[PDB]
Every structure is written in C-alpha cells, then in structure tokens.
Design a protein around this ligand. Structure first.
Ligand SMILES: Nc1ncnc2c1ncn2[C@@H]1O[C@H](COP(=O)(O)OP(=O)(O)OP(=O)(O)O)[C@@H](O)[C@H]1O
Ligand SMILES: Nc1ncnc2c1ncn2[C@@H]1O[C@H](COP(=O)(O)OP(=O)(O)OP(=O)(O)O)[C@@H](O)[C@H]1O
Ligand SMILES: Nc1ncnc2c1ncn2[C@@H]1O[C@H](COP(=O)(O)OP(=O)(O)OP(=O)(O)O)[C@@H](O)[C@H]1O
Ligand SMILES: Nc1ncnc2c1ncn2[C@@H]1O[C@H](COP(=O)(O)OP(=O)(O)O)[C@@H](O)[C@H]1O
Lengths: 326, 531, 44, 109
C-alpha cells in the first residue's frame, strides 16, 4: 500500500489519565515511556487517532496518536510532511522520535527529558492552518499579528532567555463598523489552549461607591499575579478582552462627568499594565471604532504595541467570505 | 550611612541621562553626607520634596525602581495613586497618615541618628488634583490633599523624610504643593541625545552580544544615526521587533505545520536587514520634521546648467556667513522667479546640505483647513520654537498663498501679512542665530504691498531656454535611445528655435510622451504647444 | 446650563460589618461544637 | 443528544396557523405587513431541523419610522400582545437615566 514510506519517523502522542481520580504528581520520564512503547509493541502498524491503554508502573493511561510521519528507509532527512490523515501508516522502530503532549484533560505532568524537543505546555499547538479559523479575507493581517505576538511563545525557553527580550502584552484592532473585528477576538480567545478569556463589556467597570470603580479594574489581574509568583515562567497564558475600549479610557484632562472617575480608572490601568512589578504572562485585546480618543500614554510601546486596521474587503475577499458563509 | 561604600553607577541600567543624575545627587543627598554637626553650624535645612516629570516613556520609573537598591536605602514604600481611596468615611485620610508612623517613631527614638526613610508616590497627579475643582459631592478628594499637606508642612520637625513624585503632567498637580518647603526641586527628563541613544542601544544589546547571538555585521553606530527621535522604550521595541524577524525564519507560523529545524536553532543570529525591516515597522510619535524637506526634493536635481551651481554656491556662502560671525544674528533671503521654474526644491536642497541642528518648512499644505486664529497661533508657535537652538534655518514656501491673495477684489488677509512682516525682522534672543529663506512667484504683488524692505538679498531663478539644457535633461531622464534623442533635438531646432518652458512641464511632457508614443509626434508636439 | 452626578460613601459604623458579627457567630459555633462533642461522650 | 432529521410540525409555535391580516385591526398598510411578517417571523415557524441545516440565525431587530400620528405604536402594541411569548419589557423614552455614577448602564444591562 505505502510502497516506500514503511517506517515511523516522528510520532506525536497525547497522554491522558483514564480515571480523573487517579491523578498523580509523579514525574514521568518521556524516554522511559518511549522505551516501554517500543519494548511492548514492536513491528506494529499504527494510524492517527488510534487509541491505546498503557500500564506504566501500575498507572493506566490513555494514549491517542495525534499525528504520524511516515518515512522510507534511507531518507537521511525527514523531508516528508507530517500527515494528520488516517491514510498514513507505518511500522514502529527503535529510533522513532516520540513526542508526548498533554491530553485534552491536561492532568498528566510530563517531564522534559534531556531532548530539547519543542514539547511545552504549548499555547499554539502543532499543525495550525489558517484555513480553519473561519475568517475570510485579511490574509496579511493574520501573518503580521502572529509574527509579532505569538512567535515568541512557541520557542525553547532557554533561547528566548538568552536573547534577553520580553513577550509583547498588547493588541489593538480598529476600523469601520462591520469589518469583522470582534470575530477575530472570539476565535483567538477560543482556539489557543489558554485559560478562559475574561470578557469585559465597555462601561461595565463603573460603580457607585467611591473607590470601587478602581478596584474593579485591579481585580482582573489578581490570578495572573498569583500564578506568576509560584510557577515562575511555566504559567499558562491569561487573556482578557476589553470591548468598546474608547468609552472609558478617554484622554484624561477634560471635564466629562464632574466627579473624576475616568481619570482614576485610566491611571489604574496605566499603573497596572507596566507598573513597578513584572507580570510577563498576560495578554489583553482591544477593539474600537475611533482610535483618536484613546489616551496617548496607552499607545506607547510596552502597552498596546501592535495596532492593526481592519478595512473593507476586495473582490477576492468577497469571494472568500461568500464561500465561507454558504 | 546614605550611600553604599560599594557603588559606582556604571553598573546601573539607566544610561544617557548623566547630568540629571549629578544634579539630583548634588541637590538631594549632598546635605546628608557630612556629619550632622556641620549642617547646623552652617544654618542650612534639608530638602524634603523631589519632583520628576517628562514625556511618556523616558525612564523615570526605571530610576525609581533601581534607586532603592543602588544607594543602600531602606526599602522604599511604593503606593500607586488611586490605591489610596477607600469606601468608608475617614478611611483614606487614615491611609495617608498611616505611612509616616515608622519615621515618626524612629525620629522620636533616636533624634538625629535616625536613618533616612524614603517613600515614592507613583502617579502623583491621580489624587492630588486641584483642590478647588468643585462638583458638590463627596469631599474625600479634597481632605486627602489637606492631610498630606498637614503632615508635610506642619511636620512638627520631622527632618528625615524625602518624598519623590513621578508624573507625566505637571500642570494638573495642585499648585498648593509647588512652593518652598514642599516639592522644592523639580527635575525635567527630556528625550535622549545621540550619544545617549548609543548608550541605550549598547545596554539593550549587551546580553544579545555576550552570548554570540548577534552577527558581527550589525553596526550600532549606523542604527543610532538612523533612529532620529526614538526614546528608550521605542528602542527596546525596535530591538525585539527585529528579533522577531530572525525568530520567524525557522518557525513558520500558520503556513504548514510546526516545522522546527533543531539544527538552525543553534545557529540563530540576527542581521542588518532584520533591523532595517524593524525600523520599517516601528515609528516614532514625535516626528516634527526632517521628512517633509526630504520629500520636497524627491525628484532630485539635474545640474542642467551653470545657474544651479552658482545659486548653490551663493547659498553655501550665506550659510557660512551665518555660521561664522557673531554680529550677524539674523539673515533673510528672497527667492523669486517665474511660476514653475522650480524654487522650493532649490531651497530645500540648500537647507539639507547645510546640516544645521534645527530645520523646518512651513507650507500651505500643513495650514489647510484651519481657522484664521489657528493659523496665527500655529505660525507664532513655530517661530517661537525656532528661537530655541543655537543655530536654525527656517524656510517659507509660496508666501503669496499664505496670505490668500486673489486679484479680483483684490482680497487678502491683512492680519497674517502684518504678523509675517513683523516677525521677519525680529532678532532672536541673545546668542542665537537664524537664517530665513522665503520663496515667491509674484514679485510685483510683494512690491505693491511694500514689504520689500525686510529682505536683505534676492535671488532670481531664470528658466531654461537653450536646447542644450533640454538635451541634458532628456539624457538624464533616459526618455529614448541616443539616436532618438539626437533626432528630436535636430527637428526641434528648426521647428521652434526660441524656447521658454520651465522644468516641471518638461518632465511631465516627457512622461506623457513615454506612455503614449515616444516618437516625435507627441513629445515635440506638446513641447511646441506649451511654448 | 450644566448638570452633575453624585457618589456615595458607606457608614463608618458599618466598618467591617462582614466580620463584626462573623467573629461572634464563629465563636458561638465553636461553643456549640464543644457542646456537641461533650454530648456525644455522654451519650456513649 | 443530536438532532437527526425526522420532523414535520413544531411544539409551541409563535404565530400559529389560524392567523390572517384581517384580525390585527390595522387598516391601510398592507404591503408593509407582508414584508415584516416575511423577513422576521418566517424563520421561527419552519421545523428546527431544516433551519439548522441552512446555518442561518434569526433577525433580532426592527425599526419603524414616520410622521406623527400614523400607526407605529399601534403596530408595536398589536405585535406585542397577539403572539405566544413572554410579556414585553416596555421602556419609555428617557426612562433609563439615573442619578448615580453607574446606574444608567446597569439599567440598560
Ligand atoms: N471575514 C469576515 N469579516 C467580517 N464579517 C464576517 C467575516 N466572516 C464572517 N462574518 C460575519 O460578519 C459578522 C461581522 O461582525 P462582527 O461580529 O465581526 O462585528 P464588527 O464588524 O467588529 O462590528 P462592530 O464594529 O459594529 O462591533 C460576523 O458576526 C460574522 O457572522
Ligand atoms: N534644478 C532642478 N533640477 C532638477 N529638478 C528640479 C530642479 N528644480 C526643480 N526640480 C523639480 O521640478 C519639480 C517642480 O519643482 P517645485 O515643486 O519646487 O516647483 P515650483 O516652481 O516651486 O512650484 P510652483 O509653480 O507650484 O510654485 C520638482 O519635481 C523638483 O524636484
Ligand atoms: N392604520 C390605522 N388603523 C386604525 N387606527 C389607526 C391607524 N393609524 C392610527 N390609528 C389610530 O391612531 C391612534 C394613535 O396612533 P398611534 O398610537 O399609532 O400613534 P403614533 O403613530 O405612534 O404617533 P406619535 O408619532 O405621536 O407617537 C391609534 O390609537 C388608532 O386609533
Ligand atoms: N535610559 C533609558 N531611558 C528610557 N527607557 C529605558 C532606558 N533604559 C531602559 N529603558 C526601558 O524603557 C522603559 C522605561 O520606561 P518607563 O520610565 O517605565 O515609562 P514611564 O516614563 O511612562 O514610566 C523600560 O521598558 C526600560 O526597560
């Protein structure tokens, strides 16, 4: 059937606990897992999405082969594209590169063995096509966004630490009504294997009692700080999306209400986005229709760095949208 | 005591701001260096308040963060402005008069032996706004200032406290706190200079260079030269934006799957083109100028005749004169000629070649759409700004249009004309120099208005008339092959030997002829028709 | 030609009323737990 | 569970089948009613299966404008109290605004 690609080059396995009540904080060696896999099952044929039950030191795990790469003997380099289709099958060998990822439950605590493999609690996972987001048009903005924002979180931590830089923590999307600047935020929030987004509608912060409007804007960052203090640089991304940004965060200095709440909210956000304490594991998304009223201090690099304009589509964009809708 | 015995300020991150550091050190902690006995013997009191202010993103918070650890100080108490306010009645004022308890206790306990306690108020303008705002509501936004003022002025002899306040807008601060005995010294932090820019670039790329992650090709001097108006934060953003490009050559986001070349991971290295692209991405927020003049000469020069060279030489002579002498603190020049001959380009060329620290251009494009009062304010502000630096060049373009001249009335705006007339004669403050260069096309109309007495010298710009100059511009434009360029000129010699066109129209005709039919029938037809 | 809003401060008396009587109910609960324990021994 | 297909009528319709434009009591406007009752109350009568196989959502807005004294409020009242739905939450014109700093938006929420 295969002709030449008869061996398994790279195999990705999602590991999950069969029983939720059997979760163990034991450190699992990926090398030992691969050794057990080869030892128990040799010269077997496996396909993507195939399931297996593994008994390791008395612990029962569910293993799902998320993807497989088939290679022929004599291929020095794995130039073959990794296939997620069930059509591809291969024969296990004592040299296949086995990469273990957390299961959809996300309860198994894997070790990083000495291999500097890509495996991390990934934000973006592998094999991510822009063709599954579900947004037509805007095929250049997506590039720019992912290059500037998420390009540095899928990289070995040692290298990024060597480079001595910090991840960006801002993103702004502006344009005329109806161009699709809220669909993007929803999909980014839902498709990125992060914690649940913290959606806030525009004027949902204000409150009656004095000194309670400011507190409501600093009760959003508490969990990020709580996790960043304990697990250091291994925390998962926290994302919070401000809707209709320009309603509250206007240029401070005018005479809007006669009480002086907007200025305090603006000051609190200014002091919490950069401040005197480092967070380095947070992301905030903004949306608006008028970008000339936002206070200037917010737009400085370090706060809302990447700014993107979403404009009306072209004929090819219209064709893509029509294809998506129908 | 007050400074650690092991410290030299070379290690600390802040770079490019050295004079400010020296001023702060001299006026703030100097009095607390000697033994106390001298100070009372000299009858000098200690300073209590320090104020830092500047544009967004200049480095003040960095200074505040690192000062505590750098100068062997007690862990400074840091409170964000809007964190003071509270719900219940009387809570806020208590919160303010709860920070000073330790200093009071130590003072009472140990007299003058008490150590120095420092507390810094971030976002000072948040709470301490003007205490006459009005609003007819809860007054907790006023008793706060009163409490702080009571504990800072009626200190009851607390002489071991130094408060530091960092802000972005001094104007909003209540005036009651800006007086002797309360926030006396005010230090301004402005944008860095070129050498400070180099220092910042070095500091940012230290770790990158140390680990051999930066290719030897990169040259920091060129980058420091290119970034005209970048502050520190923008420089850091540029650094990481440039690094993103290098990152995005092994990991292809979106396209395909996750293909990580584990071998090129060890060869990761930044290069110059990445930095240039990053320069493309990031933009400054200050700008002012140095771009309009460059775009104003986009078409470039051609040196089609000697007149251009002579005019440029005269401009060079005048710039030299204004550069050297100390008695000539003001020079004005007029550049007049037929319409379309090309005048703004020449002035921009001379100004760019001058290389002075300050250069700007005023044109009707900027002023379009404003009201008259706005125009007047804009011109006044531009002049006042120009009166700042030691050497300055100012270019005024199409004077007649700035005054809204139409010959049917004749209608024009008298206020703007009078302001320009008075301004063109005002010598700058002591020990400053200015060179004004104004261009026009309606010499006679200026003669009628009787403003011809405020110009020291005039320069004419005659348009070209000899077919040789046409041949030069043709060969420079690469319109046609050599044979065609010869044939067109021989034909035009007998078709119409006498010639008066200009320059702009020539290029326009050249392009139109290129588009439709480069043969004679179009270019020569148009050229003869225009003349 | 102008208008104005209005804000509100809570009563000082209230103070930390969340625990003004929480501490007291917690103390009584501890007394009741002691009572329950002693009754358990007595019933045994 | 999953929605298969088999389905003819619906359980609690909105307009019911015993309806005709001569029962409302609004005279004159006749084409407007056809337009309104096709665009808005036509996707809530078909069986849910087919409407789910088309991947379309229902319209959630309606605006009536005109001169003074023409029949707008009459139409609103009749539509509100001649269907099978929960009671309308009527709001007058400036009935939302409140005195405190953050009570108007809460009233809209
Ligand atoms: N590529 C696309 N661009 C825009 N809209 C799209 C696209 N693909 C599908 N749509 C549809 O169009 C709608 C676009 O509106 P969306 O929810 O993005 O709000 P928006 O355009 O940001 O509007 P507003 O600025 O008024 O909040 C989506 O709800 C979706 O149903
Ligand atoms: N000496 C020159 N050599 C080459 N190109 C020139 C020269 N002088 C002017 N130009 C070009 O001619 C064009 C017209 O110049 P410019 O815009 O200054 O015209 P102008 O006569 O000042 O305009 P206006 O008629 O609107 O007052 C520009 O593209 C400029 O670069
Ligand atoms: N088409 C109609 N058929 C029957 N009665 C009508 C019609 N149009 C208006 N009326 C009568 O007019 C009365 C007032 O009309 P309606 O309540 O629609 O006012 P409206 O158009 O909302 O006016 P306004 O602009 O002042 O709010 C109704 O009670 C009804 O008796
Ligand atoms: N000498 C410097 N001047 C300005 N910024 C610097 C300097 N050195 C480092 N930086 C970087 O610039 C930022 C300092 O900006 P900051 O002072 O926090 O802004 P703000 O002035 O609004 O408080 C930090 O990210 C810091 O790492």
């Amino acid at each position: 059937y295969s002709g030449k690609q008869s061996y398994l080059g790279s195999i990705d396995i999602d590991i999950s606990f069969r029983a939720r009540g059997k979760a163990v904080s034991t450190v699992f060696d990926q090398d030992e897992l691969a050794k057990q896999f080869v030892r128990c099952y040799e010269s077997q044929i496996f396909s993507p999405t195939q399931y297996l039950i593994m008994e390791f030191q008395g612990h029962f795990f569910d293993l799902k082969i998320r993807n497989v790469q088939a290679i022929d003997l004599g291929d020095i380099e794995p130039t073959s594209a990794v296939a997620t289709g069930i059509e591809t099958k291969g024969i296990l060998t004592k040299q296949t590169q086995i990469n273990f990822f957390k299961g959809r439950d996300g309860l198994v605590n894997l070790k990083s063995s000495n291999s500097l493999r890509p495996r991390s609690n990934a934000v973006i996972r592998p094999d991510f096509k822009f063709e599954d987001l579900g947004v037509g048009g805007l095929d250049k903005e997506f590039t720019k966004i992912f290059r500037r924002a998420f390009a540095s979180r899928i990289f070995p931590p040692s290298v990024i630490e060597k480079l001595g830089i910090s991840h960006v923590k801002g993103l702004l999307l502006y344009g005329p009504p109806g161009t699709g600047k809220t669909l993007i935020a929803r999909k980014i929030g839902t498709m990125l294997n992060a914690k649940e987004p913290k959606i806030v509608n525009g004027p949902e912060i204000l409150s009656k009692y004095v000194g309670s409007s400011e507190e409501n804007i600093r009760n959003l960052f508490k969990d990020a700080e709580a996790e960043y203090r304990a697990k250091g640089e291994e925390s998962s991304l926290h994302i919070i999306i401000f809707d209709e940004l320009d309603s509250v965060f206007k240029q401070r200095g005018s005479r809007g209400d006669g009480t002086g709440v907007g200025d305090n909210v603006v000051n609190q956000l200014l002091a919490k986005m950069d401040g005197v304490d480092q967070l380095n594991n947070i992301l905030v998304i903004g949306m608006t229709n008028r970008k000339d009223l936002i206070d200037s201090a917010l737009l400085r690099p370090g706060r809302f760095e990447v700014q993107v304009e979403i404009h009306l589509p072209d004929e090819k964009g219209r064709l893509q949208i029509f294809d998506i809708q129908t | 005591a007050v400074i650690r015995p092991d410290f030299k300020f070379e290690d600390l991150g802040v770079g490019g701001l050295d004079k400010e550091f020296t001023k702060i050190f001299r006026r703030a902690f100097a009095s607390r260096i000697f033994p106390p006995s001298v100070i009372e013997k000299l009858g000098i009191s200690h300073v209590k308040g320090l104020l830092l202010y500047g544009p967004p993103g200049t480095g003040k918070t960095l200074i505040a963060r690192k000062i505590g650890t750098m100068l062997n100080a007690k862990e400074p108490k840091i409170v964000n402005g809007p964190e003071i306010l509270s719900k219940y009645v009387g809570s806020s004022e208590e919160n303010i008069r709860n920070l000073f308890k330790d200093a009071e206790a130590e003072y009472r306990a140990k007299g003058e032996e008490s150590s120095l306690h420092i507390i810094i108020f971030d976002e000072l303008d948040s709470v301490f706004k003007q205490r006459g705002s009005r609003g007819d509501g809860t007054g907790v936004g006023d008793n706060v200032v009163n409490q702080l003022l009571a504990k800072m002025d009626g200190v009851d002899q607390l002489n071991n406290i130094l408060v530091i306040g960092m802000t972005n807008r001094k104007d909003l601060i209540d005036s009651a706190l800006l007086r002797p005995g309360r926030f006396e010294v005010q230090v301004e932090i402005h944008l860095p200079d070129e050498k400070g820019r180099l220092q910042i670039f070095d500091i940012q790329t230290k770790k990158m260079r140390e680990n051999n992650m930066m290719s030897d090709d990169v040259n920091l001097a060129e980058l420091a030269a290119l970034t005209k108006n970048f502050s520190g934060a923008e420089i850091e953003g540029l650094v990481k934006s440039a690094s993103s490009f290098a990152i995005n050559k092994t990991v292809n986001i979106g396209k395909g799957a996750t293909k990580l070349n584990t071998k090129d991971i060890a060869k990761l290295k930044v290069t110059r083109e990445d930095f240039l692209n990053a320069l493309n991405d990031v933009t400054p927020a200050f700008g002012i100028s140095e771009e309009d003049l460059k775009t104003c000469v986009e078409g470039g020069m051609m040196l089609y005749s000697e007149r251009v060279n002579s005019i440029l030489k005269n401009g060079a002579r005048y710039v030299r004169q204004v550069r050297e002498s100390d008695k000539s603190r003001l020079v004005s020049l007029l550049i007049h000629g037929p319409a379309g001959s090309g005048k703004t380009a020449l002035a921009a060329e001379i100004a760019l070649k001058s290389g002075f620290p300050f250069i700007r251009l005023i044109s009707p494009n900027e002023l379009s759409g404003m009201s008259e009062s706005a125009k007047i304010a804009y011109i006044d502000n531009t002049f006042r700004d120009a009166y700042k630096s030691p050497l300055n060049i100012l270019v005024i373009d199409s004077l007649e249009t700035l005054v809204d001249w139409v010959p049917i009335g004749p209608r024009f705006s008298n206020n703007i004309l009078q302001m320009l007339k008075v301004a063109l004669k005002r010598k700058p403050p002591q020990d400053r120099r200015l060179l004004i260069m104004t261009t026009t096309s309606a010499y006679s109309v200026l003669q009628q208005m009787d403003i011809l007495s405020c110009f020291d010298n005039e320069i004419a710009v005659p348009n070209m008339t000899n077919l040789d100059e046409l041949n030069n511009v043709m060969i420079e434009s690469n319109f046609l092959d050599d044979a065609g360029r010869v044939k067109v000129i021989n034909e035009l010699s007998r078709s119409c030997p006498n010639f008066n066109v200009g320059i702009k129209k020539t290029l326009t005709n050249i392009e139109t002829a290129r588009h439709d039919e480069d043969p004679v029938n179009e270019l020569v037809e148009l050229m003869t028709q225009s003349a | 030609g102008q208008q104005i809003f209005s804000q509100a401060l809570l009563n000082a008396n209230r103070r930390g009323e969340a625990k003004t009587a929480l501490a007291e109910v917690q103390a009584r609960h501890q007394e009741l737990l002691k009572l329950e324990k002693s009754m358990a021994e007595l019933t045994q």
